[PDB]
């Protein structure tokens, strides 16, 4: 009754393979309690339900034949399920097992173990599924997959079952669930929904594997358990609806009485009186609904009920509005006039006040031939009597204020209901507050609690543990309306949510699984841990009016920034999406103001734009620089980023790694990129070469030509590193660059962490298509989701309605898709113009933008292609090995302030020297290296030192 | 009862006002300590006045222009911050775009909320009462048409919210750019950092 | 020209029509049941009364 | 519907008459008259760009 | 309940909606983190503002 | 063309709306007037709602 015995079977589902599908087919949740076994050893069994599952062992037949089925009374089967002709009978010798009005409905003769005859129900007839009986389980409960379908449906109709016969029984619940079909379409271990919140996540995402993150699981509500239909309750209505009096052509009353307590027109409910038609209401909800109209009101034509009909009601007879609510009943066998009216009538008009001499006069009581409606208001009440429990405080119920059905708690009548003392409305909904009909001193203002549920999943490849948060919660308690398994399980009582938790940590750490609200989580002896999201590390470096940190060394870091450039652009041909192979609806396609054509036009626009985006991002050249056959450029092993070796048809090594990371007849197609990955690789070559060989390949006219070390010399010079290290540190700069490429090759190309941001587009695009195609499997109120079934099932005059309903549904979904894609296209366009900008200013030149072209002082960026995107390897300068030097802006004794020309007057406590914000590299003050304006000035910061003039030359 | 039960709720930000203010504190502190000398986290400490001299030199005037005018400059700065303290008060400009964005969304829901009451061609819109009045068989319009109407209103809401989000994303991208270039950096760009 | 409702069409490639392949046969596949459905036992029954 | 019938490359459990794709469109059908299942590909289709 | 079962006739409507809304929600947090939470360090404002 | 495409798409967006009116949306006709001329009393609400 444990070990998660899987209550899985093929729910008469079409064979599918390599899929994940959800349904609600009354499977067996893993909730089993106790079973009926060990009756004898060296005690009858009578469990019962409709929602059942049986399983057991084997030695012979064991069950003395498997049975199902009152006693010899009605619908009694006791199917033998033995070799000798299993028959569907509908109670004598079969009462005991054999060995040691007999009307039959069907004959089948279908024929330690794990024999399963599970999953029973009627569906008007019979249902039974069965599983293989493995004999090597060497235990009591097998890790299994599912039960098969020999034949399930037979003419049984058992309203109840209680027949059986080392024994196992489970009971079914109408829960939703996920079934995984492998490549052979074998259902593998399934996931029940609401078994546990992790399973809820798996259902939520329709995916067993769940990455670490906060997933929004199904919402939660407390269950309304009772209801109020209260009214003071106890008129002639109950008897006078019938009247011998028959004058209705000159009379249609409305208010015979203003207040009735005897309102039960069962004359309609059971049709105990006559035929009728109800408008806007059920004929049976006579004491559930109430209106303030209790009476009202014939002709060969009851066709003239006419809520806006084209009959004699238009001008002679009684008229009702097209938007009419009420119910009409008729009478016959009964053995005033409908004369001509020059004027027309209005709804509910009662006018009983030129054709020569025939306009002024105005029945026949003889049997010429065998040849009455109550209007319903929208409202309080005073009809349709009913009574229930008294007002219920502090718990939620249905039917608040009788005439309406709400789920609110009936408490806190802190509202006056000043003018009418009956009803209140919310700031945003019809119902907010009521005054109880019998005791008008108490109110309903507190609807049964409800909210969303976020679930913290640590990642299923690490842990199956979860934490759950009710988005809006008192953090005082959580009700049990759902997994129903845990207690409410010490949990951080955070506003973010608090039902079942995680260790609420008094320490602080980096953010993970961010629930939000300044709170993060992880699984770090494994358990879910909830943290107050910490900030970056504290930096306590002291500052002073004379303290300056100056680097003595440096590093070259390569920032890998990956940006989407283009979508997996598609074109949905609605002719198929909506009308694939359907010619009846062909007329409907024409019906539109080319709406379909316009939707496709929008996707074509998106697609063209996507090519334009790729073109701006990569195609800013007229002549492409062919990478020189050198591998000699300061030793920088650009061979790792250039597509030189021609091993793959065109790709560079880094782009190979990028391409190594990261759906037919869908009614749509994914249009090929205009520029193939090969072409993009070649444009990448065109940019990298040129970038490392000339510079501004576009801006400077193929950028003439640069030795590359002169190039990065100038790039250092651009970032602010002047005449410092680009020449002194040859073989060190190159080595740091090289190592940085190694750092990318074994880090992001091994993880695809930063690289997964590309998929933020690709995934979404796929999901969008996956949404769209999945959206097809929808009825939208149509008889079926399959258009061809509508065509095969309904005639033209009747089919068109449902065809159009399905079409409308699919068009709404397609418009949704086009819209979603148009907006994603705009977003990717924004990322594409960012990427193009970055290629233009980071690759085709040296951008002075701080912390823009990578982290730190960007001097260079080497682009590589990625599926539908670009990865920029921004080689940036980073200062390192900082030392805390003493600074000042000026000196004197020379009668000259001598401010540093470009540097800083800096000292190590002595040796005042001048350097820049690049490297220590100290220099003697060197008059030619200073700027003088102000002499010995009152200006702050004079340190009274001296500088040698190179031209003293004494 | 400003925010009622409509299924329309707000999930708290990951970075709460304390977290935002806390990060802002770090940002300002970095500004007054390294200014621009950051390896995107690798801050290099500089004295503030000295940072101003360097920034001034980065804008085409000499370091001494700042230093000679240290008192002027610092005092002009103090006056300017006071000016803003007052100019950002008295509901000036409703704090610009920020109010607009919130207004862009609360209304997005007031609209969505209003649509809750729309009948969508039906007699009524109170779905619970509609079901009470009539049985599902007789609800192709009473429920499903109503559902479709709400479906479209929600879909319009998300669509508009996605546009709102796209617009916001662009604003955020620009703001991030300013955060790394205008602060924690020295912009050489006209009107990037204001006139 | 019709797709764009214009007689002069700018140089370029346009998403004009819909390509589907015409089926070449009508294939009828039903179980080979030779038993005429006993609708008579349903509709020509001697007694429906109960 | 309309589509290309081909011998499937996979045998499916006898309990079902036909199968379905990821798009919830028919993937394959076992012949009611023969002990075989045939993959059904929607007849070749796509756009026409002029 | 009846209307929820009827809403399900509009197959997986909200799964798409909820995903779009969630996507917006994470995008919002991404925007905040990207815009101002740009530092790996929290330099503490000096106690003496000289 | 940059500045033509924008005005273009804007105007095209208007052009589209004009074309849209021509749709019957499954209605007995495309214009409210015809609906109001054929089945006005009993079905104007239905055809108009469509």
Numbering used by the authors:
A (entry chain A): 29 to 70, 81 to 107, 110 to 130, 134 to 143, 164 to 174, 187 to 240, 264 to 332, 336 to 398, ...
B (entry chain B): 851 to 1045
C (entry chain C): 300 to 349
D (entry chain C): 548 to 597
E (entry chain B): 747 to 796
F (entry chain C): 946 to 995
Original paper wording:
Many pathogenic viruses rely on class I fusion proteins to fuse their viral membrane with the host cell membrane. To drive the fusion process, class I fusion proteins undergo an irreversible conformational change from a metastable prefusion state to an energetically more stable postfusion state. However, while both pre- and postfusion states are usually immunogenic, the labile prefusion state has been demonstrated to induce a more potent immune response in multiple viral families. To address these limitations, we developed a general computational approach where the protein’s sequence is optimized for the conformation of interest (here, the prefusion state) while destabilizing the other conformation in silico.
Notably, the spike designs enhanced the protein expression of their base construct (S-2P) by approximately 17-fold. Furthermore, the 3D classification performed on the spike cryo-EM images also confirmed the prefusion integrity, with particles displaying one receptor binding domain (RBD) in the up conformation. Solving the structure at a resolution of 3.7 Å revealed that the S2 subunit, the only part engineered, closely matched the computational model, with an RMSD of only 1.345 Å (377 Cα atoms). Finally, the Spk-M design achieved stabilization through four substitutions filling cavities and five substitutions increasing polar interactions at the S2 subunit, including three interprotomer contacts. In the postfusion conformation, these residues are situated within the hallmark six-helix bundle, where charged and unsatisfied polar amino acids are highly unfavored and can potentially disrupt the core. Given the requirement for a solved prefusion structure, our hMPV F and SARS-CoV-2 S designs were based on pre-stabilized constructs. In the cases of our R-1b and Spk-M designs, which introduced only two surface-exposed changes each (N175R and N380K in R-1b and T941D and P1143Q in Spk-M), this may not pose a problem, as confirmed by the RSV vaccination study.
